[PDB]
Symmetry: D2
Subunit: 186 residues, 4 copies
Amino acid sequence: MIPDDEFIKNPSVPGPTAMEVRCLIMCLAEPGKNDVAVDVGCGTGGVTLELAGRVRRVYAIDRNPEAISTTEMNLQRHGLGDNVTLMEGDAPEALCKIPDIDIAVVGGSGGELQEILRIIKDKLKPGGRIIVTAILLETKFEAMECLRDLGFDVNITELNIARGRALDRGTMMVSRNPVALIYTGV
Amino acid sequence: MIPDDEFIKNPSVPGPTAMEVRCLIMCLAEPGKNDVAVDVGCGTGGVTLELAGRVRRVYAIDRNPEAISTTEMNLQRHGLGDNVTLMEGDAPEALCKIPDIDIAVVGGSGGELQEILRIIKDKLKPGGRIIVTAILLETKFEAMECLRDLGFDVNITELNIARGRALDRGTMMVSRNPVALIYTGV
Amino acid sequence: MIPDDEFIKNPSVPGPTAMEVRCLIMCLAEPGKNDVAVDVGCGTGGVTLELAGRVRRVYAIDRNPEAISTTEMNLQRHGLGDNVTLMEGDAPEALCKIPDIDIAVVGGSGGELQEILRIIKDKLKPGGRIIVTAILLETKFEAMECLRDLGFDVNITELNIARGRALDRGTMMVSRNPVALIYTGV
Amino acid sequence: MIPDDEFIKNPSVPGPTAMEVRCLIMCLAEPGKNDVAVDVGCGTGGVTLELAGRVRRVYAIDRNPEAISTTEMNLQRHGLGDNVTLMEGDAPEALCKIPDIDIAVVGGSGGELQEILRIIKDKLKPGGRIIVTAILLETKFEAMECLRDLGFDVNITELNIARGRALDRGTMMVSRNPVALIYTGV
């Protein structure tokens, strides 16, 4: 899988999502070659890239134009993006112009989370999966609540990752900030 | 991916490895359909199952006959195991009868870790990967040292996973014991 | 400080709170010899014991009579409890009969958290501290919200602790479930 | 207790130790007013400050002159340091000039860990405590081994701490790198 350092960063744009988290998002998403996915809040483009290479069509969204831009760039350095539709703007609105989806990953919920999830429910093909990435405590609560209220069986997994940094004296463990994944039954 | 609960457990046999960990072992392994992998210390069979479905050949090992047994069982309930050679016995010895490998995962090192690693170095096809699973503090150190001494560029990632348990009052976070993955450059 | 094993447990009663968490609760509470504290949801009595030996007066509460009982016992085996008022019953009600407080620790919020906090606000002496112990995801959210809505500057620290268990083969790290502490400025 | 931000930093000098870790070091140290402690590798001076205010005599050491300097400064801004002997130089040598100790905290082992511990064993008053702070994976292993070989009953606790950072959108959890404390029985 593509490591975090082989991504082009932009200060105003957050990400890339830790590879270990991306790794898991894919396990949960169960990507299929005929699937249509939407990555709300694509940011650096980490999820989009991984999805890009495993599904039929990927619809990437972000309010931040810098994000849309960083994702396009990262799509290129890796040679992907033909099956990717980039959409700059407000998520709810962009979501209404998309076909139905088999997979929905919601990252930077930009505080319109509840609205985004309702819409996504309405377009979720039978057997579809939703995976919300949470950094803020509040998102972890809101996601769980919304999905539950939308009738899904909800689950949550928090990941605390530490990677070793080679120093001259030895190997010190460096932490990543905790990331939660709220996901619906398959 | 197959969740932890859809595995058949045996008291004397440890595992299955947390799905989140298994998920990452695959990312790191970079399974290819023409690859030959060896899962030293297959235990409940978690890694074996995931590798079974992505590579050409899998050679599963464990001193514990109960493990070998539980792995066979789990292979069946999921419909895999044709490309799997089960080998009960001592790792070093069983290793010597195997072809060369593209991927080497070492779980229950059974304290003969250093010997196992040397052997594995000697059968590692160019571009091969080694991934050691560590639960004991000492294994984390030994793996890093050995692989380094065997001339590999070593890395380590520790995972601390908490999953939510639905109670009547709410969702409580339940921790898994920390698991480290020492791995060699690709 | 008193370690977890030197406490008398009761199945129906949760606790004791990890020593590492108790240790920090004290750091945040800044116990003073002329302070009056209330420990809502005293359970096994861990926080109560620690507070007992550092402040003037301690008011311990719990709906569970088994809790009230285990705390009294634990107070004895360690020779403390003279400055401790045990109150069995419903927190909101027992809170109304208490003097003002310098320190308030809320553990088993028993789902009446929001009410408890209001009441506690109303009896908090200037320079008083509130520290909420959270195990459920929902509590972490609710505490933060409430305290914020009550006009406090809120903070949160989550603790993930692993202690080594001596085995014959080596030292394995055993995890404790994550604990959050939501606390107000001093 | 003094928070991390109320410490003066210096780039070449690491630290201060996270307050949550310092908090625990004290728990384990069980500081007494007539105790004599040594803080090997004082760095920014965090532990030294805390010990300064609770024991009779503190002997602070560091190869790094900047460290010795930052510590003195930090001692001042907080009005402590009269009972503190600062010693710049090589730990083993500086240790030989000190009286016996009740408490020994070893932070920046500067790779002479094994020698430092032997020496400390030789000056440890009956009922004395040793606490080694570990950042590097290798230190965790070395400390455990040494202390064990020196005949102590050894323990280890790893701390993974996340504190919330108030953002405009919400509260994000920010991790601290894992820290292990290897300590001897009391």
